[PDB]
Amino acid sequence: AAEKVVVNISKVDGMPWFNRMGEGVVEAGKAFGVNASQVGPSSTDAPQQVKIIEDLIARKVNAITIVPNDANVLEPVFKKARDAGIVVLTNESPGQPSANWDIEIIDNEKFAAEYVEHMAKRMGGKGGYVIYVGSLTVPQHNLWADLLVKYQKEHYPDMHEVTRRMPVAESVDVSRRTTLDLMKTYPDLKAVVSFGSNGPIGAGRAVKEKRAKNKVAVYGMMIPSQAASLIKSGDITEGITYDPASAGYALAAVASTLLKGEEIKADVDMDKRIIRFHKVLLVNKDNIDSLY
Ligand SMILES: OC[C@]1(O)OC[C@@H](O)[C@H]1O
């Protein structure tokens, strides 16, 4: 008979991050004997993900995996997928109610700690910072940001957010303009953190334009090839982030296991429904050339 069908859904198409994720999805399909694909929505508007899922339910797929733009917007349609007998997995949505499992490639608490310790060392434990998130509701960016700020307050009291987190991390242009604006406004701004993959690109371009790389550090999630030029020029300080092909691969792998009626085999937290690895990738001037 035909292979079972596994479909991943990214946050939005046309992104290096999600093209790399898709490579992992497709490779896992070959590895595990499932018909695996990835659909990229036209925008980050969460209803576009809902519409894709409705289409996939209609087409009777076996598993749907997804990087949610908004956990709560998707809950009703995830319930409909589960009612249809479809396995639903998320990445970047710990605690998603209606997903069989959420998969993460890093440990949230350790990841936030690493951001703060890296930032504090370069800032001497003192100064302003800002966080960019993809949106005000996207799940993981906001959990990571929460943990970062909490950790900072409990370790380095002389560091401080210059503003509330800014929902700009999915746009290079907007991230760039925001960074220019903040650098002009806040003399003590010493670091920009972006949890979305486009934000370090925009921030790094702003820092470059203002010739500010020794004053304003840039950290965040990123694809090495996208960030390489700015890393080399020193305008992006460091990527603290993971290989999204691992996420794509793990999603399709776990789907395959469930579809084969097998028990899950990482930290597997049964009651929280989270499968977690700890595969942090640091991206810096010393290793950039090894990474793309
Ligand atoms: O730009 C896409 C993205 O937001 O960046 C990193 C990761 O969180 C991913 O979902």
Residue numbers in the entry: 27 to 291, 302 to 328
Question: What's written in the study?
Answer:
For example, we recently identified the accessory ʟ-arabinose uptake (Aau) system in the attaching and effacing pathotype enterohaemorrhagic E. coli (EHEC). Aau is encoded widely by EHEC strains on a specific genomic island and is activated exclusively in response to ʟ-arabinose-mediated regulation, enabling enhanced growth on this sugar and a competitive advantage in the murine gut. In addition, substrate binding proteins (SBPs) are typically encoded at the same locus and capture target substrates, dictating the specificity of the cognate transporter. Here, we show that Aau displays a > 200-fold higher affinity for the monosaccharide D-ribulose, over ʟ-arabinose.
To test this, we overexpressed and purified a recombinant His-tagged version of the SBP from the EHEC Aau system (AauA; locus tag 0432 from strain ZAP193) by metal affinity and size exclusion chromatography. By contrast, incubation of AauA with D-ribulose resulted in a dramatic increase in Tm of up to 16 °C. To verify and quantify these findings, we used Isothermal Titration Calorimetry (ITC) to gain insight into the thermodynamic binding properties of AauA. Titration of ʟ-arabinose into AauA showed a weak binding affinity (KD) of 598 ± 132 μM for the sugar, whereas D-ribulose was attributable to a >200-fold greater affinity for the protein (KD = 1.98 ± 0.3 μM), indicating it is the likely preferred substrate of the system. To investigate the mechanistic basis of these distinctions in substrate affinity, we determined the AauA crystal structure bound to D-ribulose. The structure of AauA revealed a two-domain architecture, which is typical of other periplasmic SBPs. At the interface of the two domains, additional electron density became evident during refinement, allowing us to unambiguously model alpha-D-ribulose within the binding pocket. The sugar is sandwiched between Trp43 and His167. The ring of alpha-D-ribulose stacks against the indole group of Trp43, and His167 forms hydrogen bonds with the hydroxyl groups at C2 and C4 positions. Additional hydrogen bonds are formed between Glu118 and C2 and C3 hydroxyls, Lys37 and C3 hydroxyl, Glu196 and Ser223 with hydroxyl group at C5 position. Six different conformations of L-arabinose were docked into the binding site, and while all conformers occupied a similar binding position as D-ribulose, the predicted binding mode of L-arabinose exhibited fewer contacts within the substrate pocket of AauA. This could explain the weaker affinity of AauA towards ʟ-arabinose, since modelling of AauA in complex with this sugar suggests that it would form fewer hydrogen bonds in any configuration over D-ribulose.
